[PDB]
Amino acid sequence: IDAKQLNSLALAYMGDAVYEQYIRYHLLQKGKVRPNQLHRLGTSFVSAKAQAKVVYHLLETAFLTEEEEAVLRRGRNANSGTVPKNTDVQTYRHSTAFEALIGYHHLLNNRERLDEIVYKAIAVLEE
C-alpha cells in the first residue's frame, strides 16, 4: 500500500477503524462502566462533531507538520458525494479529514507519531 498516493476516502476508511480501535481500548482500560454504556461513550470520541473539534484544536495549536496538514486538507474531500443526514457538511469534512490522517500514519507504520496524535485527540476530548 502506497499511502502517499492513496485517495483520501480510502485513507479515511482505514483511519476510521484505526481510531475506533484506540478508542474502544481506551474505554475498556478506564473501565468502571457497564457494557451497555460503551457505545454511547465511544460516540463522544468518534462522532463527526468530536473529530472536528480535535481537528480544530490541532490546526489552531500547530500540532501537525505541513505534510500532515496537507493530508487533512485533502481529507475533507470529495466525500463519496453524499453527507450523512442532519449532519453539518463542514463538520463532516473535518471529521473525515481526521480519519484520513489517522489512516495515513497507520499505513506508513508511523506508530509513535500515531500514538501522539490519538492520545492528543483523547486528551482534547476529555478536557
Q: Which of the residues are catalytic?
A: 16
Query: How far is residue 51's CA from residue 6's CA, in Å, rounded to a whole number?
Result: 21
CB burial string 43-64: b at 16+ within 10 A, e below: eebbebebbbbbbebbeeeeeb
Which burial class, exposed, middle or buried, applies to 109 when counting CB atoms under 10 A from its CB (0-12, 13-18, 19+)?
exposed
* Residue boundaries of the structural domains of the chain: 1-127
Resolution in Å, one decimal, please: 2.2
Residue count (the chain):
127
Check: CATH 1.10.1520.10 for 1-127? yes
**Hey, what's the cell of 7?**
485517495
Residue with the three cell numbers 474502544: 24
Residue with the three cell numbers 468518534: 46
